[PDB]
């Protein structure tokens, strides 16, 4: 059943207005993102994809709109996104998928506003935040990652799958000193799905993913 669920989130069948992908140098999110695209097409739901780019310089083949955000101010960014989506009040429009390649580039004080502005019944947002890129009220205001995990309706925490001698802890210690070992960024990797149900009772499962054969398996941890 839990593999069924993950397949339902990835195909955008199990609706979730904000899907947060956490990644790192050890295993970036682009493969996971191609799973969303694959499972979407696959399970019949072929939605229009609006791609917001801060660091993606090669326009993905699967997107229908591509916004280069690097030069744009915040409000101007929001206005572009909004103009490609349906009127939040239409009651009769196609569901759009918005992909943001990195939330690290948006100021912490604008994060909630941004999410509030793009939110729409006709829209699902998949955004990635890089766990290892670091950020009068800032002191007390929650850090970007705590904030984003709080706002997300679904969380997908991506990790490397280690074929060698080291585990994920010793590797994060190596990366802290920018010592890059071999065997990172693989076609097979793992993820931890947190899904927030209507009660508030949150589900949480781990999975091995094969971005080559688009096949997932629960992880008996």
């Amino acid at each position: 059943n839990p593999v069924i669920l993950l397949k339902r989130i990835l195909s955008l069948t199990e609706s979730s207005p904000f899907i947060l992908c956490l990644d790192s140098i050890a295993q970036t999110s682009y493969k996971l993102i191609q799973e969303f695209v694959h499972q979407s097409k696959s399970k019949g739901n072929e939605y229009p994809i609006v791609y917001i780019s801060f660091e993606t310089v090669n326009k993905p083949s699967y997107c229908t709109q591509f916004i280069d955000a690097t030069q744009m101010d915040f409000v101007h960014l929001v206005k572009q996104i909004i103009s490609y989506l349906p009127a939040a009040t239409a009651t009769q429009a196609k569901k759009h998928m918005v992909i943001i390649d990195s939330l690290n580039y948006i100021s912490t004080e604008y994060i909630t506003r941004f999410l509030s502005e793009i939110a729409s019944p006709h829209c699902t947002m998949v955004a990635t935040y890089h766990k290892d890129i670091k950020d009068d009220w800032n002191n007390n205001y929650p850090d970007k990652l705590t904030l984003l995990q709080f706002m997300a309706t679904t969380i997908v925490d991506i990790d490397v799958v280690l074929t060698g001698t080291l585990d994920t802890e010793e590797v994060s210690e190596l990366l802290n000193e920018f010592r890059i070992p071999r065997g990172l960024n693989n076609d097979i990797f793992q993820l931890r799905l947190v899904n927030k149900r209507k009660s508030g009772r949150s589900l949480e499962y781990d999975f091995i993913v094969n971005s080559n054969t688009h096949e997932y398996e629960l992880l008996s941890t």
């Binding site: 909630t112 009220w137 205001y141 929650p142 705590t146 709080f150 009660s199 949150s202």
Partner: protein, 223 residues
């Protein structure tokens, strides 16, 4: 001042002092006063996984509207929140001081703007306090429930409000009103501890008369 034959008020076992029902049967006994004494405040702290604390917030509010609805039990509920569907999500029912509520049934008639008033936390602190004062003063002789459904929810509270002088100034000012109209005012607040730094949480707790921690619902309290 208030009315003596008020059904929402009763002397606590522990003290001579007037108290009111949290709208939560169990919670009343745990407080140690069979309720929340007038002129006092509780802060309910909860982990991320919702929403047991927004439930006690709604019970607390619902309890006050029922009182208002048939001696007497006049009360006015003030909600500090941007979510106005809080008023439509309040549970329905089933001396007459505490009631058993049903989380699945809403309240029979919907609460009117004269029974319950919203105040947005997206305003300056001066303004919020003015509204609360002004609302308290014009509902003179009415018991007053102030409910802050989730203190410092980042979607409702502007970043600049997280500066100490703003949020603690707000809490100091609200506490000041609670003690000033101790005759008839009471305050309930909840907060999600996963988005509050420990220093700020320490400051916050100090403005409240009692603090309740919920771990899933089991209640460990700091009187």
């Amino acid at each position: 001042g208030l009315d003596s034959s008020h059904v929402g008020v009763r002397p606590s076992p522990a003290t001579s002092q007037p108290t009111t029902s949290t709208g939560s049967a169990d919670l009343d006994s745990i407080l140690g006063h069979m309720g929340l004494p007038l002129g006092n405040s509780v802060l309910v702290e909860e982990q991320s996984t919702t929403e047991f604390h927004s439930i006690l917030g709604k019970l607390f509010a619902a309890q006050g509207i029922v009182h208002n609805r048939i001696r007497n039990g006049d009360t006015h509920v003030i909600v500090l929140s941007l979510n106005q569907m809080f008023a439509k999500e309040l549970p329905g029912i089933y001396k007459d001081y505490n009631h058993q509520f049903d989380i699945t049934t809403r309240l029979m008639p919907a609460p009117i703007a004269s029974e319950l008033t919203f105040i947005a936390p997206t305003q300056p602190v001066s303004t919020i306090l003015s509204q609360i004062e002004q609302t308290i003063k014009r509902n003179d002789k009415k018991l007053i429930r102030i409910v802050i459904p989730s203190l410092l929810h980042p979607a409702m509270y502007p970043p600049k409000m997280f500066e100490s002088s703003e949020i603690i100034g707000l809490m100091h000012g609200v506490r000041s009103l609670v003690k000033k109209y101790y005759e008839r005012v009471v305050l309930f607040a909840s907060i999600s501890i996963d988005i509050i730094t420990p220093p700020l949480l320490v400051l916050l707790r100090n403005m409240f008369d009692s603090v309740i921690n919920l771990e899933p619902m089991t209640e460990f309290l700091e009187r």
